[PDB]
């Protein structure tokens, strides 16, 4: 256990980041970085968007995202999907874009399916979309696998007609990883290479409750500093407070503010706000 942060604070992390020792940063991100876009966190205790779905009489809220339940009762999921593209990436997303443009970003691992990282301008090389994406959709039957674009799916969703394969009549499923499905091979492939060489783990907007994604915090070497920007402490192995704490830092608050506070310390606050402004205005002018 070599000690790489001089102190366990945001400022300490900021100084380490500006040091020659920090060349490779991995970001693990979850639902917290997209809630200011308006996409609610569907595992948060007080979450406010299963409201409409009372008519479907769910065995419990989470069933909607279970693969077994979905395949027999897809309607609740698609009604949710019509309520929710219209979302621009947030400050958190553009901070990651900033890390890439400054040559610090090794990779962003995301739990989110909203595709906001790509919109913010992270390229496909830089991203591991651990739970897949809404962008593309597939017929669920092994011997058809017909591909349908977002355009097609949205037409079906907005009309409240359950998406169905035009060829074989099977269910058409967005390319996301439902609970009980396997993660993409890219996830397992990238983790084997990425985590050997990482100098800093930035964990943002995730309570680290979904496996195997959550186990990624364990994969970096023992000396690797780990910063959690989140509403509350999570991943507790993450040791923030014990007298044996040596490398993990928690910044508790909304992720956007954490990224602004961190960016401020690195001297990038101005470049960040300018980037966000220009990128938003470009999406508006679309």
């Amino acid at each position: 256990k070599e000690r790489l942060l001089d102190e366990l604070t945001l400022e300490g992390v900021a100084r380490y980041m500006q040091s020659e020792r920090c060349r490779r940063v991995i970001c693990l991100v979850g639902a917290g970085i997209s809630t200011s876009a308006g996409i609610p966190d569907f595992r948060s205790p007080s979450t406010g968007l299963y409201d409409n779905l009372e008519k479907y009489h769910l065995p419990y809220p989470e069933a909607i995202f279970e693969i077994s339940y979905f395949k027999k009762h897809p309607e609740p999921f698609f009604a949710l999907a019509k309520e929710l593209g219209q979302f621009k990436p947030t400050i958190c997303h553009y901070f990651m874009r900033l890390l890439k443009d400054k040559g610090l970003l090794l990779r962003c691992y995301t739990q989110n399916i909203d595709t906001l990282e790509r919109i913010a301008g992270l390229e496909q090389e830089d991203l591991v979309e651990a739970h897949g994406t809404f962008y593309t959709s597939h017929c669920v039957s092994a011997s058809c696998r017909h591909e349908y674009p977002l355009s097609w799916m949205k037409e079906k969703i907005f009309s409240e007609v359950t998406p169905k394969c035009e060829d074989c009549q099977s269910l058409v499923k967005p390319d996301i990883v439902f609970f009980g499905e396997s993660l993409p091979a890219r996830f397992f492939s990238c983790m084997q290479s990425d985590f050997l060489k990482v100098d800093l783990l930035l964990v943002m907007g995730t309570s680290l409750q979904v496996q195997p994604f959550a186990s990624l915090i364990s994969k970096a070497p023992l000396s690797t500093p780990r910063l959690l920007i989140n509403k509350e402490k999570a991943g507790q192995g993450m040791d923030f407070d014990s007298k044996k704490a040596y490398r993990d830092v928690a910044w508790l608050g909304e992720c956007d503010q954490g990224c602004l506070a961190l960016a401020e310390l690195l001297g990038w606050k101005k470049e960040l706000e300018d980037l966000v402004r220009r990128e938003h205005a470009s999406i508006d002018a679309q």
Binding site: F178, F179, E181, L183, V210, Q211
Partner: peptide
């Protein structure tokens, strides 16, 4: 291996 929790 499978998405859980």
């Amino acid at each position: 291996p499978k998405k859980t929790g």
